[PDB]
Amino acid sequence: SELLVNTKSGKVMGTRVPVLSSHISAFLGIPFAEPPVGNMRFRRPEPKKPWSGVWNASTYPNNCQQYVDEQFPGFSGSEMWNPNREMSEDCLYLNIWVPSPRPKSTTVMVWIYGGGFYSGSSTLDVYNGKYLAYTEEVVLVSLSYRVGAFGFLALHGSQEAPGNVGLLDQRMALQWVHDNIQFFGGDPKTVTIFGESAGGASVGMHILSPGSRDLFRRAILQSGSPNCPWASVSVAEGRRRAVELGRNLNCNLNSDEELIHCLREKKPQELIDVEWNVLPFDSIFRFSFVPVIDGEFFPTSLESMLNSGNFKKTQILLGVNKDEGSFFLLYGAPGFSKDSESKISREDFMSGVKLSVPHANDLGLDAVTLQYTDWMDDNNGIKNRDGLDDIVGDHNVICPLMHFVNKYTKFGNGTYLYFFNHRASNLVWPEWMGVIHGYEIEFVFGLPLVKELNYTAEEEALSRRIMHYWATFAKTGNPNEPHSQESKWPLFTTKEQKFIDLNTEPMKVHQRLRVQMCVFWNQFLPKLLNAT
Amino acid sequence: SELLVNTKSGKVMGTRVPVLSSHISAFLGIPFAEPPVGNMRFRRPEPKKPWSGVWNASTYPNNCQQYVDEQFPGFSGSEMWNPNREMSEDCLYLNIWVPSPRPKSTTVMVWIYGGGFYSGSSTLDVYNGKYLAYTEEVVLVSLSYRVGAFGFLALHGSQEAPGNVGLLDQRMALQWVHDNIQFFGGDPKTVTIFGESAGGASVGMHILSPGSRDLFRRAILQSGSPNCPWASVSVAEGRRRAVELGRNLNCNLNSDEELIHCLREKKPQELIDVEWNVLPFDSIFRFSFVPVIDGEFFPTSLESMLNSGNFKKTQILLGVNKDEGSFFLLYGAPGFSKDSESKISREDFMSGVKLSVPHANDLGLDAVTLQYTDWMDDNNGIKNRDGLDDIVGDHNVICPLMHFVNKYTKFGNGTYLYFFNHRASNLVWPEWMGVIHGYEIEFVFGLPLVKELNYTAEEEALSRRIMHYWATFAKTGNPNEPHSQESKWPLFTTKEQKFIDLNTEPMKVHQRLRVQMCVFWNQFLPKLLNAT
Ligand SMILES: *[C@@H]1O[C@H](CO)[C@@H](O[C@@H]2O[C@H](CO)[C@@H](O[C@@H]3O[C@H](CO)[C@@H](O)[C@H](O[C@H]4O[C@H](CO)[C@@H](O)[C@H](O)[C@@H]4O[C@H]4O[C@H](CO)[C@@H](O)[C@H](O)[C@@H]4O)[C@@H]3O)[C@H](O)[C@H]2NC(C)=O)[C@H](O)[C@H]1NC(C)=O
Numbered sequence A, B: 001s002e003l004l005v006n007t008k009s010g011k012v013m014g015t016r017v018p019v020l021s022s023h024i025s026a027f028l029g030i031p032f033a034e035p036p037v038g039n040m041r042f043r044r045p046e047p048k049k050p051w052s053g054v055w056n057a058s059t060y061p062n063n064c065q066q067y068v069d070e071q072f073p074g075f076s077g078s079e080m081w082n083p084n085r086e087m088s089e090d091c092l093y094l095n096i097w098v099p100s101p102r103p104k105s106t107t108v109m110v111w112i113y114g115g116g117f118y119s120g121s122s123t124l125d126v127y128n129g130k131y132l133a134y135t136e137e138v139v140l141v142s143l144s145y146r147v148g149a150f151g152f153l154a155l156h157g158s159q160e161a162p163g164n165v166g167l168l169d170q171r172m173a174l175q176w177v178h179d180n181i182q183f184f185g186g187d188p189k190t191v192t193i194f195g196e197s198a199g200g201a202s203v204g205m206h207i208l209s210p211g212s213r214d215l216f217r218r219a220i221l222q223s224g225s226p227n228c229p230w231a232s233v234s235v236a237e238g239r240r241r242a243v244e245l246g247r248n249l250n251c252n253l254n255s256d257e258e259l260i261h262c263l264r265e266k267k268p269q270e271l272i273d274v275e276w277n278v279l280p281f282d283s284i285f286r287f288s289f290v291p292v293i294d295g296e297f298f299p300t301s302l303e304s305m306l307n308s309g310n311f312k313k314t315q316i317l318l319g320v321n322k323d324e325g326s327f328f329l330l331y332g333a334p335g336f337s338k339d340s341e342s343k344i345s346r347e348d349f350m351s352g353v354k355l356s357v358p359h360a361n362d363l364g365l366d367a368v369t370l371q372y373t374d375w376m377d378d379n380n381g382i383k384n385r386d387g388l389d390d391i392v393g394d395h396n397v398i399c400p401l402m403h404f405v406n407k408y409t410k411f412g413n414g415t416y417l418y419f420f421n422h423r424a425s426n427l428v429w430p431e432w433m434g435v436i437h438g439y440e441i442e443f444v445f446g447l448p449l450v451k452e453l454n455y456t457a458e459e460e461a462l463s464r465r466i467m468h469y470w471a472t473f474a475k476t477g478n479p480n481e482p483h484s485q486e487s488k489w490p491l492f493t494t495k496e497q498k499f500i501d502l503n504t505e506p507m508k509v510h511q512r513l514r515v516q517m518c519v520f521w522n523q524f525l526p527k528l529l530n531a532t
């Protein structure tokens, strides 16, 4: 039977799922590790013990324990990202969509969800892999990994809570795929890992980390890169936050063992309830428990690894959306609300700058303010709003990615860069938020092919074009068809720095993506903060 | 006789001069002080001893001793600014042009020449006051003052060389005009002082200095303001430069008396020959012997005087040219030459930035570089050239003036601001230099009315318009005619910051003259240099 596959861990039975008037196979909720519960909370994951009999892989697994956004109850724009399954610490599972009839040895794509390392689920409607698997004839995997304190509490020096264990979850799923995807018709020497935001940062982290490099062929990073200011902390800052978490829960803090034992006695929701209290600064686009620069998963600082070419050398395809910042200004920055145009005063602009660059002295804040203010028209509430939007996007996503891109391309085997700037016609978020963080994903996963979801024909065409770029890149290391009528997505090079836009209009090639702003963020501002 | 005038210092006899097919009177080379020679070198000026008989005022006086530009021998563009009379330390004279028939009590305008406080002459062709006096029916005075070490060598604490004596020369000429211009038909309660560059800075200095305020009614500043980075030094820096001058001439340096006595034994050309050796930095737009912040002429720092409203409160009319910097890049900055388009490489751009902001650390230099570089096209030699041109103009002229303007207008009785951006059709300098420092002067003095000089009809009209604005402002405190068909030159206000352009095209009102750049120069950069 086509729904029965014998793996090295045991037999799994999948389910036939309908998709655009046809069908494919799905193997949902396959375990790749032992449940990380009890004394295993905060520990590195263990490989799943093989089972006899047949694992029922007909339904989605639990989602990992996480903070649940209730800022807009009932609102699809926000709840679309929340867990849609029961939350559990028993959450280390992966999902596989397989074309029918079963391929012999085809391109594999492994999805890594985002959510700021504090949230995320493999099971979101918007991550349904059936449309991509069916349309591009690829084996689509989605993995899971622990988030929040559960995945990233870091007490460096301790083996009970070393940090980075959520990244190790990801690596174990990748190990599992590497070892077993052949039985589902996947080619394990042609695996592309891809992810958005924290998932994109995660992808770049597996490129960097020696222990992950051998488990995949190439990579796609969407609106995220490993050097993002929010995506990692030092061992000292990780340690401080873990101790602050313990302090919030009345833990004994005399030793790592005392602290960890206390944190393991707590119910998951007790940890989640105080998780946001441990940030060092009043800030936006900052998350409590994230990867840690430990000297193990990351042998040295990310920047020294990038400058010295200490990373997997392969092909990468990556890019950003036009208005990455807007989500994070809505959730915390004064003057921004969901149901107004959010025209920002000078004062709220200043407050927004302070929140956007929490690690900066007054001179730094002035520098940012100068750089993003039109002084011919400084009381224009639209310009202040959009300027803040750009600050948050440039600092947290675009400029870190452009730094990564430029560093990677010196040593890599091929870079393809995109700027996604189409606002979906059926967006429920207000116009001022623009092309929002995470809203290219639905095009990547092919949702505009479903008529019931109210996309335009032009949007269907954009989704097909993106899916085919992604899958063709996964298969060959080049998103362009060997012989096509379409104009080419050009290679990104050190010299010419070319990229394309992704939208419903005819494709255009541009150069030097937001270079003026990114020289400020990547070269001037750091040098300024280091000097004062 | 119309050419004979009795003053409080004695009788003067002038000469009839032709002007645009008519005639007016001229009283040239009238002494307003004792010759500052011998033991009087470096001293404050003494009032001229009254004379019996008739002073022959038929010819121009000597020019003050100064460095003579020989960078382009034979070239009118440069030599037009050099001394056209014999140079002498005996040079404290003023010139008066008087309408015919002699007025009873009319508007007086007193011209103060520029030249970086190291050069300048009252007698230049381009300062011939006859066209302005004749056309606008004003009594036009031009004064002189000591320049270089002779006018500004400063050993604070000493009464033999206190500094600022060139400014005191100017003040004495203004005292003389105040006391005697009535006999030439001038109204001494309606005297406007005006000047360009160091002359404009000088005008603003007489506005600030308590001892000069009462000697004039209103002021016009052209491409200069008292707070310009090149226009003053501290007492300590003045002292250091004077000692360095002595060191260059093998002087005894054990005391102020020893140093000063040595400097007085030297011929004027010996001082001039080493004058440029005492600058502290490799720089452009910096001059050796300039006014000094002494606590006497200037009671406190210029900035504290400006913030507290410690200055003459009256009407001011002032402005700048489009390409103030180009002259100073030609004379020293690598990559710039007179007979090429002077396309600048990145490396020469960097060198130019270093020379333009000599007082800046590397972070400061980076900040300037970032601010004036198009990072989409950073190897464009035209953009690098023009960017450097703007750096030099913004830093040295426009932004200091805009700071002065904004500070003055809070307390003043009326501000009128202009941006002069017409390139003369008969300019001998190359196109890349644009609208050059000092090339509005010829329009102010009415030279385009002379057919032989090869100006266009449109340029004649621009000159008449400028002369009439200047003279009407001098007369009334407002450049606009009570009832005119022309559209108004609007008042400059704190709120709206309006100004006009001056060119052959129809006049347009603009706002916030180069505000983006001047926020950088006036607020950000100083704060940056103070912090590191
Ligand atoms: C594609 O586009 C189509 C067409 O635009 C969309 O189709 C429609 O979708 C909306 C849903 O947003 C639907 O609106 C409902 O209509 C009902 C019938 O008139 C209303 O009764 C209902 O109101 C309830 O929900 C609102 C919140 O959404 C509340 O504000 C309101 O108070 C009502 O709440 C009631 O709910 C509880 C629980 O039942 C009840 O006990 C209480 O009494 C309470 O009052 C909605 O307004 C449209 O009618 C649909 N239109 C058409 C033509 O089909 C479709 O959604 C789009 N598809 C996608 C995928 O986006």
Ligand SMILES: *[C@@H]1O[C@H](CO)[C@@H](O[C@@H]2O[C@H](CO)[C@@H](O[C@@H]3O[C@H](CO)[C@@H](O)[C@H](O[C@H]4O[C@H](CO)[C@@H](O)[C@H](O)[C@@H]4O)[C@@H]3O)[C@H](O)[C@H]2NC(C)=O)[C@H](O)[C@H]1NC(C)=O
Residues within 6 Å of the ligand: A412, A413, A414
């Ligand atoms: C990604 O990596 C692949 C594989 O590493 C890489 O493909 C390789 O490109 C190089 C070009 O630099 C090829 O090297 C050439 O091979 C031929 C035939 O074997 C030689 O004759 C060539 O030597 C001549 O030309 C040189 C200039 O390139 C001269 O310096 C020399 O004097 C000779 O005249 C040259 O060595 C190599 O064959 C391919 N390999 C494969 C398997 O295709 C690809 O370019 C990389 N892509 C990116 C975007 O980085």
Ligand SMILES: *[C@@H]1O[C@H](CO[C@@H]2O[C@@H](C)[C@@H](O)[C@@H](O)[C@@H]2O)[C@@H](O)[C@H](O)[C@H]1NC(C)=O
Residues within 6 Å of the ligand: A056, A058, A059
């Ligand atoms: C496999 O599982 C299917 C659905 O799984 C279910 O989930 C658990 C938690 C219970 O709620 C259970 O009642 C559900 O059935 C079944 O529909 C299917 O029959 C199962 N097949 C086999 C062979 O076990």
Ligand SMILES: CN(C)c1ccc2nc3ccc(N(C)C)cc3[s+]c2c1
Residues within 6 Å of the ligand: A069, A276, A285, A327, A328, A331, A332
């Ligand atoms: C969905 N997005 C983008 C975001 C962005 C920032 C955020 N910051 C918070 C800070 C505190 C907090 N508490 C419950 C204390 C909850 C949240 S939720 C949240 C959601």
Ligand SMILES: CN(C)c1ccc2nc3ccc(N(C)C)cc3[s+]c2c1
Residues within 6 Å of the ligand: B069, B276, B285, B327, B328, B331, B332
């Ligand atoms: C006419 N203009 C704008 C300028 C500008 C700057 C200048 N710098 C100099 C420096 C040294 C020097 N020496 C003779 C040593 C002569 C000059 S001349 C000179 C003329």
